[PDB]
Amino acid sequence: MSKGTSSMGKRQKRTHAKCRRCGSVSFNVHTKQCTSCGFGKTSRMRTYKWQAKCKY
Amino acid sequence: MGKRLISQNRGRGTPTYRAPSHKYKADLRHPRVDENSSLRGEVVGIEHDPARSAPIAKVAFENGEELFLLASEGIAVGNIIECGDDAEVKPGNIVPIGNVPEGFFICNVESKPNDGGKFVRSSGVYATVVTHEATRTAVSMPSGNIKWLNPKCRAVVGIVAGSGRVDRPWLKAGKKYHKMKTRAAKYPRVSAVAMNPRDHPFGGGAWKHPGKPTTVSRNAPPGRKVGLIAARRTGMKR
Amino acid sequence: MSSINYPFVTEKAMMLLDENKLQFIVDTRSNKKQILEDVEKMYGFKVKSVRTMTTMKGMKKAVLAFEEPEAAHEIATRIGLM
Amino acid sequence: AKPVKGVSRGRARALAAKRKYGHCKGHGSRKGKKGARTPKKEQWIKKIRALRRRLKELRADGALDKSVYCRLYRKAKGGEYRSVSHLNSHLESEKLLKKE
Amino acid sequence: MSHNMKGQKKRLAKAHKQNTRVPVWVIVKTNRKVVSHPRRRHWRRRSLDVK
Amino acid sequence: MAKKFTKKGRISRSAGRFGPRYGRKDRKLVADLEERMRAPHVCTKCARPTVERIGTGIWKCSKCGHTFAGGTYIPYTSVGQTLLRTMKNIAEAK
RNA sequence: UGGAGGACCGUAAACGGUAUUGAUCUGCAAAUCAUUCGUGUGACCUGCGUCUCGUAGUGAAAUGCUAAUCUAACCCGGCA
RNA sequence: GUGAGACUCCCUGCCGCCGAAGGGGCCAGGUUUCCUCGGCAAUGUUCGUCAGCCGAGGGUUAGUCGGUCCUAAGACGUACCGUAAUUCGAGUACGCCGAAAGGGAAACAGGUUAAUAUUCCUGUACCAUUUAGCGUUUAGUCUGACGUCUCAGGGCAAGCCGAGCGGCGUCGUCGCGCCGUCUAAGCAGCGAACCCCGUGGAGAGCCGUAAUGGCGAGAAGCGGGCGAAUCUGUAAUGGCACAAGUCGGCUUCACCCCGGGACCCGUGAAAAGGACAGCUAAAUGUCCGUACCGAGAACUGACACAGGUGCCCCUAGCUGAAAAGGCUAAGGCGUGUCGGAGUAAUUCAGUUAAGGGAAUUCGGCAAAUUAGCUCCGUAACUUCGGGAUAAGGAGUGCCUGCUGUGUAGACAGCAGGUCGCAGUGACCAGGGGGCUCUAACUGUCUAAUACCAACAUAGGAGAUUGCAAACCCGUAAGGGCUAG
Ligand SMILES: [Mg+2]
Ligand SMILES: [Mg+2]
Ligand SMILES: [Mg+2]
Ligand SMILES: [Mg+2]
Ligand SMILES: [Mg+2]
Ligand SMILES: [Mg+2]
Ligand SMILES: [Mg+2]
Ligand SMILES: [Mg+2]
Ligand SMILES: [Mg+2]
Ligand SMILES: [Mg+2]
Ligand SMILES: [Mg+2]
Ligand SMILES: [Mg+2]
Ligand SMILES: [Zn+2]
Ligand SMILES: [Zn+2]
């Protein structure tokens, strides 16, 4: 259908479930990883230095 | 970077260019036989193979294990096969090419001994034994070339079944469409001169022409060997 | 751990008591065997079966059916539901 | 509960009686293609079944031998009789029955 | 009908229990300084992401 | 004998199911191949005409029960015939 | 008699989107409505599941599509 | 009637809407919207005593319904190896997950609540695992387990007709019209086709089918065996105004069983489970879901949104080829949530129009004409298939009495009379022909200004490569094409 409100009626599925380790709704049900804390990918918790300004 | 070509996409192995393996019945190979052994077996049924569009035979051997085999023409349910070194020459048996007489037709020939067979396998093809020197034997391949094979190579005697498959024209896009669903090939294929200059070396322009010569050298980098790859000649015969 | 918290005393639970049945609020992390053994030890009445329900408030209701007639009446008498 | 009011059917019933007699069915009331009103395969099936049952009973009682029975069977398969009375007419004309 | 497991139903029960008007005695004790909480919603609005 | 081969209805044959499509050449080729395929082939054990096509290159005898692999559109091919002739003559010369 | 075909007609079943350059154009709607139309046993339409992604993917090829964004997406950082 | 207050809330009567969807069942999704009582500041395109709104309370019960169990595409984990290195990377071995529409051990009727019911209660059943007793394998096969089209046979829910019995309506005249006349699983019995066996002796030919066909490599015929849906009895006493509760007939899809044929350069899943050795008795059958909506007000698009998801699966009488269009049942509604008054121009969408008939306009744009079925008749050209519904003509209602085919349902045809301006009388329902350009055709395309001559296609030709190949992906380990 149209790219606007006509194709937004098929919006009945879900792509992210709820994570066990952090409780945030960011668990990818296809790749089986949490996109916020990294659960499923690793035993460590996801942190990147680009999640904040260079502190200078 | 103008987009990669179809050949490189096949290289990556994306799901659009991967063969649907689960449809195929079974892999075709010669029975494994130890040194100085000769096992027999009688055909149990004749069956259709979707990976080649030709029949295959199911054979139950004396040890117990059954194997699908490349079916040569004339194979019938009930006949026994005598694969081994001591087999006689008959239509159906598997024998070394060293002790096959000149003029006999063979098929499912191997490259090196105990490969299972790699040459002469499509429908209705066949090869011939020409000469028997002490160390090699020359067989004329279905392409038209002479190949020098080891005398201790195995090949079934006869010609591959299903002869004449390409005497029936498609005359539709639908029938050829249906064949392509059980193969890795993509159908249908766009022509290069109708693409954009990102997509292909030949694309672009206000009218559809190649622009540059179609013959390409053998040393061209990947992503450029499109057209007549290292042709020796062009055109029909005048 | 204790699996029975307290009898449930709404209007529907009262009518179950007519044909010799009760309705307890049990610990939500428990099954039918544990409920059976706890009630049997606590009142000495041989339970017959047990039906369980999870409610939208969070708790977990259980309906006990006894074998000996008039047992539910006197259990409710001593417990103080009456 | 108030009674349900159905749909009366007396008028259609009388009309159906008239049609069953053979009226109210003229060319001006057909609106579907011939074949939609009577498929041809059903016509052939009923015709051939009637013809075969009649020939079989003529063979069974005894007034028709094997040779003429075979000939008439294949002939009716070929489509030279259009009805049972037509077949009886040819049988009683060409004398192929063994009535005495 | 959205067949749920035990945990999903548990979280749904909690989110149900959070839709409550603040008790009247709380408003009396705090002298009309607490009159609402940020957990109030309505079922036909923004969907909750409990599940 | 067969369907009405009128003053016209005689050239297309089995290719008349394609209507006015695909051109004269392809239709003629398919038609001729179909009359070759529909032929009353002969058995090798029975020596009675009973062979029909079961699948792509599979053939069977209706009375005899014999199953074998052959051509895709015709039971016996010329190259197989030549192989039989040559090998049999070699054997019979012994 | 028989019942083939990328055959025919045709539903406001389904899918599509010709013309009115109609209605609306701070709309019912950030692309809809009415009439008129095209396919409708097949290279058909479709539910759920699963896979392929950023100098990469997919494309019966228009520079089309990749979450109202595409001649190189989006979030944050280099960056005041 | 209620209420301080009534176009808007409630009851009765009349008049209406959808009636192959606006009704019924339910997935995903929602998450208490479900029921009762008490309210009307806000929400509701007006008001409101009403409410999917606000406050308080209440409501979901399973050995048999699902999940759970098996595996498909395909994921993930540990090890091995690579990488400067990892949370990164292909393959191999061993595991493990993946379907609430695939496979699958077992339950039906009635009652009860304000809101739950194959779950609770009454009655009648059935299936597994363990323990004890009494015996035993054939253990290797069968089943689960399979495409598209087309057709015969049998059965049945729905539907229709006649007679009797009980109610309701109409009643200016007549005596018709409608509703009801019910009954589950389980258990016991029977078996149509295909197939197997014992006889049989058929050709200058016989036996059959809707059709293909069968036959001394053994037909017809005569016997026996394995073998379905459904049907008959019981369960038969439950429900019904404890009011009747008895019988016959026709048809039957869109549902079930069984068998045949055709087609493929398409061949149309796997595994758990079940069958073959079981019989009797007691005990056990844990866990999770169960309310309500499922959409012109309970989902998604910021909304009580004319879109989309769901037209996903089902549906009565008449007309009719029909699930089309029209008119009515059952069911749901008067909420596709502003009213009163009736009088200008103009505007959106329709009905009709003398005489002329494209003279309008870039252009017959727009609108009109024709339209169903039967019969007669049908051109240039042509790849011999077509063109073709060519073009062009005639008939059609109602009443009376009949004939033919058929087991029947029904279908086809005739003779006479007769009315109207008009007989497919409304609904529905092609305007046709000729000469050129272009692409062979069916198909695809700029979601939201471009449905085309553009793309694709079958057909023709050329080139590389004998497999440790040609072509390509990766830093590597290794891979795609390739079960070739
Ligand atoms: Mg977009
Ligand atoms: Mg820093
Ligand atoms: Mg370039
Ligand atoms: Mg059409
Ligand atoms: Mg920036
Ligand atoms: Mg109506
Ligand atoms: Mg208001
Ligand atoms: Mg339960
Ligand atoms: Mg599982
Ligand atoms: Mg007004
Ligand atoms: Mg075209
Ligand atoms: Mg082109
Ligand atoms: Zn997480
Ligand atoms: Zn034979």
Mapping DSSP onto H, E and C, the string for B78-99 reads CCEECCECCCCCCCCCEEECCC
Residue F47 corresponds to which tokens in the numbers above?
């020596």
Residue B163 corresponds to which tokens in the numbers above?
């002869």
Q: Which H or E element spans position A34?
A: strand A33-34
Q: Are C69 and C34 contacting, i.e. CB atoms less than 8 angstroms apart?
A: no
Alpha-carbon distance values, B166 to B147, D15, D35, E26 (Å)? 26, 65, 43, 90
Contact B123 F80 (CB under 8 A): no
Q: Is C22 exposed, middle or buried (0-12, 13-18, 19+ CB in 10 A)?
A: buried
Q: Are C62 and C47 contacting, i.e. CB atoms less than 8 angstroms apart?
A: no
C31–chain E Cβ distance below 8 A for any pair: no
Beta strands C47-54; A27-28: pairing state: unpaired
Beta strands B228-229; B215-216: pairing state: parallel
In 10 A of CB B135, how many CB atoms?
7
E-proximal residues of C, 44-63, CB under 8 Å? 54, 56-58
Q: Which H or E element spans position C33?
A: helix C32-43
Residue B4 corresponds to which tokens in the numbers above?
């990669």
Residue A38 corresponds to which tokens in the numbers above?
């990294």
Distance between CA atoms of residues D59 and A4, nearest Å: 79
Which residue has 């006949």 as its token pair? B79
Give the residue among B129, B106, B130 at the shortest CA–CA distance from B118. Answer: B106
Residue B132 corresponds to which tokens in the numbers above?
């028997």
Q: Are B28 and B107 contacting, i.e. CB atoms less than 8 angstroms apart?
A: no
Q: Are B135 and F49 contacting, i.e. CB atoms less than 8 angstroms apart?
A: no
With CA of B194 and C1' of each nucleotide, the nearest comes out as G61
Residue B82 corresponds to which tokens in the numbers above?
């005598």
Q: Are B169 and F76 contacting, i.e. CB atoms less than 8 angstroms apart?
A: no
Please note each residue after which chain C is broken, C-to-N distance over 2.5 A, or write none: none
B123 vs F30, F58, F72: nearest CB: F72
Q: Are A54 and A41 contacting, i.e. CB atoms less than 8 angstroms apart?
A: no
For residue F16, the 8-state DSSP code is G
Sheet holding B137-140, edge to edge: B94-96, B154-157, B105-107, B127-132, B137-140, B146-149
Total H helices, total E strands in chain C: 3, 4
Q: A11: Cβ–Cβ under 8 A, 6 or more apart, which residues?
A: none
The strand ranges marked E within F1-94 are: 51-55, 58-61, 67-69
Considering every ligand atom shown, identify the ligand nearest to the alpha carbon of residue A8 and give its number: 1
Q: Is F5 exposed, middle or buried (0-12, 13-18, 19+ CB in 10 A)?
A: exposed
Asked if A9 CB < 7 A from strand G, the reply is no
b/e map of D12-22 (b: 16 or more CB within 10 Å)? eeeeeeeeeee
Give the residue among B229, B213, B233, B210 at the shortest CA–CA distance from B221. Answer: B229
Residues of chain C found within 8 Å of residue E13, distances taken between Cβ atoms? 56-58
Residue C45 corresponds to which tokens in the numbers above?
């009445």
Alpha-carbon distance values, F15 to B114, D64, F25, F33, F35 (Å)? 49, 45, 11, 10, 10
With CA of A30 and C1' of each nucleotide, the nearest comes out as H75
C29–chain E Cβ distance below 8 A for any pair: no
* Chain Cα centroid distance, residue B67: 20
CA→C1' distance for F66 and H218 (Å): 20
Give the residue among B46, B40, B80 at the shortest CA–CA distance from B64. Answer: B40
Q: E34: Cβ–Cβ under 8 A, 6 or more apart, which residues?
A: E22, E26, E27
For chain D, list the contacting chains (3+ Cβ pairs, <8 Å): none
* Chain Cα centroid distance, residue E17: 5
Q: What is the largest CA-CA distance in chain E?
A: 45
End-to-end CA separation in angstroms for chain A: 50
- Which residues, listed in sequence order, are joined to residue B106 by a DSSP beta bridge? B127, B157
For residue F15, the 8-state DSSP code is G
Quickly list DSSP for chain B.
-----HHHHHHHT-GGGS--GGG------PPP--TT-B--EEEEEEEEETTTTEEEEEEEETTS-EEEEE-BTT-BTT-EE--BTT----TT-EEESTTSPTT-EEESB-SSSSS---BS-STT--EEEEEE-SS-EEEE-TTS-EEEE-TT-EEEES-BS-TTTTSS---SHHHHHHHHTTSS--SS---GGGS-TTT-TT--SSS----S-SEE-TTPPTT---SEET-S--S---
Distance between CA atoms of residues D76 and D82, nearest Å: 9
Give the residue among B91, B89, B106, B83 at the shortest CA–CA distance from B34. Answer: B83
Q: How far away is chain C from the Cα of E15, in angstroms, using its nearest Cα?
A: 10
Residue B189 corresponds to which tokens in the numbers above?
């294929």
Instruction: Return the SS3 of A5.
Output: coil
Residues of chain E found within 8 Å of residue C56, distances taken between Cβ atoms? 12-13, 16
- Which residues, listed in sequence order, are joined to residue E8 by a DSSP beta bridge? none
b/e map of D32-70 (b: 16 or more CB within 10 Å)? eeeeeeeeeeeeeeebeeebeebbeebbeeeebeeebee
Contacts of the segment F3-11: beta carbons below 8 A, 24+ positions apart: none
- Asked whether at least 3 C-beta pairs link E and C within 8 Å, the reply is yes
Alpha-carbon distance values, B48 to B111, C60, D1, F57 (Å)? 26, 61, 69, 8
Residue F44 alpha carbon to ligand 14 centre in Å: 6
End-to-end CA separation in angstroms for chain D: 75
Say what the alpha-carbon torsion angle B50, B56, B57, B62 is, to the nearest 10 degrees.
Answer: -80
Which residue has 């028997």 as its token pair? B132
Length of chain E as a residue count: 51
CA nearest to E9 within chain C: C56
Residue E41 alpha carbon to ligand 7 centre in Å: 22
Q: C8: Cβ–Cβ under 8 A, 6 or more apart, which residues?
A: C23, C24, C25, C61
Distance between CA atoms of residues F79 and B128, nearest Å: 12
With CA of B208 and C1' of each nucleotide, the nearest comes out as H454
CA nearest to B56 within chain F: F69
Distance between CA atoms of residues E11 and B75, nearest Å: 69
Distance between CA atoms of residues B86 and B154, nearest Å: 12
Q: How far away is chain B from the Cα of F2, in angstroms, using its nearest Cα?
A: 25
Instruction: Return the SS3 of A17.
Output: strand
Instruction: Return the SS3 of C47.
Output: strand
Amino acid at A6: S
With CA of B185 and C1' of each nucleotide, the nearest comes out as H481
* Chain Cα centroid distance, residue B3: 32
Q: Are B55 and F55 contacting, i.e. CB atoms less than 8 angstroms apart?
A: yes
Q: Are B100 and F83 contacting, i.e. CB atoms less than 8 angstroms apart?
A: no
Asked if B194 CB < 7 A from strand G, the reply is yes
Resolution (A): 2.8
Distance between CA atoms of residues F85 and C35, nearest Å: 89
Give the residue among C18, C26, C19, C17 at the shortest CA–CA distance from C55. Answer: C26
Q: Are B81 and B92 contacting, i.e. CB atoms less than 8 angstroms apart?
A: yes
Distance between CA atoms of residues B22 and B53, nearest Å: 16
End-to-end CA separation in angstroms for chain F: 50
Q: B67: Cβ–Cβ under 8 A, 6 or more apart, which residues?
A: B29, B31, B58, B59, B61
